[PDB]
Amino acid sequence: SNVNHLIKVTDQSITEGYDDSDGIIKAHDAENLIYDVTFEVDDKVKSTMTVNIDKNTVPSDLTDSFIPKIKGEIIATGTYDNTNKQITYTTDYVDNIKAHLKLTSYIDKSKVPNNNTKLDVEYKTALSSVNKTITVEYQKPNENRTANLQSMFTNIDTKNHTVEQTIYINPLRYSAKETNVNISGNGDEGSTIIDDSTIIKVYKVGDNQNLPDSNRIYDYSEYEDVTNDDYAQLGNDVNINFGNIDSPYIIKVISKYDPTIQQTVTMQTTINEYTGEFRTASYDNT
C-alpha cells in the first residue's frame, strides 16, 4: 500500500542546469531542472511511495518516451504517469533506510507555449514539497529584410539515429517573394545527413492561427499540410521552393545522423522584383 506517510523528507532541492542563468530557464538552450531529494524510510515499510515533477515539466525534451531507481543495493523501482506528472516507486530489501533521488526534468512546451512565462515550479516527495520561481524564456526569429525563420530540434531517436527539426518560415508574416529555403547537413560544429531518405513535411499557417513560441508543434493535425515533393530538390543539402509567400509555414524534417549533430536552415528572398537581388537569413541548431 501507500506509505507516503512513512517517508521522512530530510532534504529537498530544485537546481537549475546552467550556472549563468539564475531565475531563468533557457529552455531552447536545453536548461534542465534537477530535483534532488533525500529521505528516510521507516522500518514499518514492507516489500509504495510517490514523487511528482512540476506540472509544467516533463522527464525529457528531445524524447517523448522517458525513470531512475535507488540503490548496488536495489531499494526501489518506479512507474511514470504523465497524466499527473507522478512517478510511483515500489523491494524485499526494505525487509534504518536512507535514499536520495536526483531527477532531471524539462519545461513541457505543450503547456508553456509563450516566452517570458513566469512559473512557480514545485516538486513533491511523499507529503513534503519544495517551491521555486523561474521564468521560461524561448527563442526569437532571425531576420534580414523580408527573410525570416527559426528552428529547433524537436525529437531525437538514438536507436535509429535520427533527429527532428521543426522550422518556422516567415513567422513575422512578411510578403516574401521568390522565397527559397535550404536545409543543409554540413555544419560548422556538427552535422546531419540530408539524402533521398530525408523526410520533409510542410504546413501552411492559417490567418487565424498563431505559432507557439515554444517553437514546437504537438498537433500538426490542425494546420493545412501542403507537402509536395515536387518543390523539394536535393543539392548535403535540400532546397524548397515557396516563391511569393505572405504567411508562416511549418517545415518538419526528420533526418539521419552519424553514430556532433547540427542542421542549418537558410531562407532567401528577392528584395528587388526588377533586379533579382537577394538577402538571406539563417538558423542552425546543435
Angle (CA) 218-220-225 rounded to 5° is: 165
**C-alpha cell recorded at residue 230:** 515536387
At a CB cut-off of 8 Å and minimum separation 6, what does 61 contact?
30, 32, 106
The experimental method is X-ray
Within 13 Å and on the Cβ side, how many CA atoms surround 158? 5
C-alpha to C-alpha distance for 242 and 180, rounded to whole angstroms = 6
Pair 59, 67: CB distance under 8 Å: yes
User: What residues form the annotated binding site?
Assistant: 16, 21, 24, 31
**23 burial type by CB count under 10 A (0-12 exposed, 13-18 middle, 19+ buried):** exposed
Question: What is the distance between the alpha carbons of residues 185 and 136, in angstroms, rounded to a whole number?
Answer: 30
Grid coordinates representing 60 are 525529457
Strand partners, 124: 52, 129
**Ordered domains of the chain (ranges, CATH):** 1-138 (2.60.40.1280), 139-286 (2.60.40.1290)
The one-letter amino acid at 144: N
CA distances from 201 to 31, 35, 100 (A): 28, 37, 44
Three-class HEC string of 235-275: CCEEEEEEEEECCCEEEEEEEECCCCCCEEEEEEEECCCCC
User: How many CB atoms sit inside 10 A of residue 264's CB?
Assistant: 24
Query: Residues at the annotated binding site for Ca(2+)?
Result: 16, 21, 24, 31
Breaks in the chain listed by the residue before each, with C–N > 2.5 Å: 47, 66, 71, 90, 95, 235, 259
Strands 24-25 and 134-136 turn out to be parallel
Q: Contact 147/76 with Cβ under 8 angstroms?
A: no
DSSP 117: E
